[model samples]
Target chain A: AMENFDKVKDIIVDRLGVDADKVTEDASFKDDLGADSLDIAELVMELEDEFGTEIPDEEAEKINTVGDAVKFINSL
Target chain B: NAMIHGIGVDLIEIDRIQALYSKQPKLVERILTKNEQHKFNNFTHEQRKIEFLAGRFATKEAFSKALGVAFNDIDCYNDELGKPKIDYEGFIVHVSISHTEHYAMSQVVLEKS
Candidate 1:
């Protein structure tokens, strides 16, 4: 299991208002979760605050899927 | 054929943006371009900075939506008369940014050159 998946899921569900079950690791935030650019930006901010890490734009843009977010945060 | 490509609109709460900025000061650097950062710094008042950031952020979001791209390459600013302009190459971009006491909003239309 991916570390911090649960925490990441909570933030995604809370920010995007999507069902918890829908926030699977492979799920794409834009394609699968219906997130727009601003939503993605806001999610980055939320994730940064929650994880105590700064996500730069280059890395943030690479986070297309829920798993991507988990991996990045864990790597940091 | 030269034609309208796409249109997008976005709205953001100014206070919410301000809170986010408060939480992470670098958030502003993440959103605004280099020139935008310069302009933003010139705003002496706190409220004006918030509004300016909100408007630019909303406009960049709208542009990304309209053109199916990202905000990093796009730059947004206003002319002296307060008309918004988005600097992007090879496309005709029409944009408008508006602000209320609590919110900032923007709309963008992308057209083929």
Candidate 2:
């Protein structure tokens, strides 16, 4: 849903401090957003808190793009 | 080249890792292996604990960069002399963990044995 994507977008923008318009669905977290592994880990923590979901370390490892995060959060 | 195959280094802010720990108490369980967990339990001060967590996280990230693989098997622990060591079989590993009040950093060197 668009609403779910918007929420995920807000978190990624705030967490990575990137330009809001750059967080497109296909945008890579590392390549486009300039995120390191620590940034991803922290983002996952915030996503977990905001969505009331638990993203296991293994699951978190697979999330590489904004769309991946939006899809994963939507699934839960 | 003294048999050095790969090297890795990582720096992480103490405050960032500390925030994640506060948000998810299970972060310790997620980041630290079992033996590492035992050692983590020994630290009483909050600052020490945050430093330890950040250091280990940095250490693992550094190792993954050097190894060119996902970091799942390696575990870091302190030896009898309190020297940080890595338990990664099949290679010669050298590691160091350093921390300031604001940041934690680590480096790893791997050599073919």
Candidate 3:
């Protein structure tokens, strides 16, 4: 289940250009990490596009951090 | 009639744009339209700033060739929904922007009616 989780963090790190260490499980995309609304939207689309996933709007809104994305991506 | 008006491409180093990103917070406003300035401000991280500048810079550079005009002569901006638009009215300027680890690339295709 956690096999695909690492890819989740890598995508965030690559897209946001944040320090790898700061992208901890507890880090929030909007709060702890510095991602604006547009950045988040772009990242979400990229994740869905690049990884071949279909994450709807409300579901995407729930993924607010690296850990959240990892878990959700694994769920799918 | 439909015709190919112009076609051009450009590339920019992320490092170069990063320097400007650090020096001038209003750099986007200087080159972009009023709405672009607002959108740029919404991105807080430096990475977002670098990407934004590179895309804009590369797109404008590409458009300069597409329009066959001097660099400063043309203006490229976005519509209400952030659709790219060029100064030359009758022609539609299509821009595609993407970035890598160290570079940003923009391709422009102009179509005339």
Candidate 4:
């Protein structure tokens, strides 16, 4: 179980090309981060590969913000 | 084009979008409202994402045409049934969207009363 999320932030920075500073709980991927549908889907795929966990679709759709991703990963 | 025609359709290439979408995803946020932008972020499949974004883009273009207005002046949002509601001058506009992997097509029609 990987508790540290620095790696998650790194992956997001690399894939989404977003600034490291703005990735937070309240920052929405689509709004503040400037991620479109494909961008978000690709990010999820990368996260799945990194964590080795198949995130459920039910949860996948609800994760619109960085905080949402962190919380879901922590649960898993 | 004038309003008497009462119909509009727009077909856009997935390729053109690919270039911009990779560069600027926020365009979708600007085009879609919170409800749709939220829905847009949730799609896990690549094809589905393409279709949804393409549909919105085409819808915007078509709705503006039907209303004889600029795209920014008009927008579209889905109803409870996930159907788009496009109204202009109290006139009901019917909308249809389609995709061919390479292209996304949308049609908007304003019927005669």
lDDT, candidate 2, at B85:
76
Candidate 4 similarity to native, TM-score: 0.53
Candidates ranked by DockQ, best first? 4, 3, 2, 1
Q: By lDDT, who's the top model here? A: 2
lDDT, candidate 4, B1-113, per-residue tens: 44555678899997677556755766676667666677876775545766787888898888777757444345567667877766666577777787897899898887644
Q: For residues A1-76, write the lDDT of model 3, one tens digit per residue.
A: 5566656666565455665567787888888878877767877787787679877888778878777777877776
- lDDT string for model 2 (B40-91, tens) is 7776556787888899999999988887733334678777787787866778
* Candidate 1 structure, TM-score to reference: 0.56
In order, what DockQ does each candidate have?
A: 0.02, 0.02, 0.05, 0.05
Candidate 4, after superposition: displacement of residue B10 in Å? 0.4
Off by over 4 Å in 2: A1-76, B69-72
Provide the lDDT at A35 for model 1.
83
TM-score of each: 0.56, 0.56, 0.52, 0.53
Per-residue lDDT for B9 in model 4? Answer: 84
What shift in Å separates residue B66 of candidate 2 from its native position after superposition?
Answer: 0.9
* Ten contiguous residues minimizing lDDT sum, candidate 2 chain B: B69-78
lDDT string for model 3 (B1-113, tens) is 54997799998999878656544545566666665666766775657767877888888888878777433344556667776666577887887788897999898999988
Best by DockQ: 4
User: Local distance difference test, per candidate?
Assistant: 0.80, 0.81, 0.73, 0.72
Model 1, span A1-76: residue lDDT tens? 3558888886766445466667898998888988877878988898888878898899889989989888887787
